[PDB]
Design a protein around this ligand. Structure first.
Ligand SMILES: C[C@](O)(CBr)C(=O)Nc1ccc([N+](=O)[O-])c(C(F)(F)F)c1
Length: 238
């Protein structure tokens, strides 16, 4: 039942709308990454709200958890796409936005990209199954919260525990749980580096000709700083 649901709600293909019939430029590549980020966020919201037990969360915490975990969720999924679509040879942000090393460099997000490429390879080296991937991604949604607590922390704690239990079941073991939780933990530092880069870019966006969609500008200026200033932190296993 649980896995039937995760498979059923898994987002389909999302395109960036990027113009690949034009020479690469920082401004065009980043505007497309931002646009793709917003397109994916729309799907992450619909995905999250259809997750088993998500409605158990207080209305106020439902949106907060999505916004705080959004980047990490995208990173994990992108890494899986890169692994399955091109065997980690390139970063598969979208069918129309595939990054080779030249683009990783041009984007000025090279360090972050190489770490995501490594994550992509991890899916292969650890022989992560599609089902482990699905359960792990759902768990990512409940892996970062405010130090001052959610409106109803207890309901969140219950749901997160339930998702960890589903992972236990998929695995069923100690050695595998160790590997998977280690992998999950590695996503956070990557999201953090992307958060910092996105924040800095938004602040100077008007100086580099980079367009930020309304919805993205809001999250990056209201939610992301809570994470960067230490008010909202990831829940690490290790
Ligand atoms: C630079 C920025 O546009 C900030 Br939102 C960005 O990180 N976009 C973005 C768009 C899509 C994906 N993605 O589909 O996975 C990601 C990723 F998570 F890779 F880093 C990032």
């Amino acid at each position: 039942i649980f896995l039937n649901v995760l498979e059923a709600i898994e987002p389909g293909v999302v395109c960036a709308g990027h113009d690949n019939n034009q020479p690469d430029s920082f401004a065009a590549l980043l505007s497309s990454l931002n646009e793709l980020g917003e397109r994916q966020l729309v799907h992450v919201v619909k995905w999250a709200k259809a997750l088993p037990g998500f409605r158990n969360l207080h209305v106020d915490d439902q949106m907060a958890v999505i916004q705080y975990s959004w980047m990490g969720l995208m990173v994990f999924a992108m890494g899986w796409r890169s692994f399955t679509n091109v065997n980690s040879r390139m970063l598969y942000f979208a069918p129309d936005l595939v990054f080779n090393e030249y683009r990783m460099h041009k984007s000025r997000m090279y360090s972050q990209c190489v770490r995501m490429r490594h994550l992509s390879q991890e899916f292969g080296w650890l022989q992560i199954t599609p089902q482990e991937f699905l359960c792990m991604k759902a768990l990512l949604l409940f892996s970062i919260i405010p130090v001052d607590g959610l409106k109803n922390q207890k309901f969140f704690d219950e749901l997160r525990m339930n998702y960890i239990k589903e992972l236990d079941r998929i695995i069923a073991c100690s050695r595998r749980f160790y590997q998977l939780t280690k992998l999950l933990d590695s996503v956070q530092p990557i999201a953090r580096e992307l958060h910092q880069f996105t924040f800095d870019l938004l602040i100077k966006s008007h100086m580099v000709s980079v367009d930020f969609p309304e919805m993205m500008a809001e999250i990056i200026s209201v939610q992301v700083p809570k994470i960067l200033s230490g008010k909202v932190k990831p829940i690490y296993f290790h």
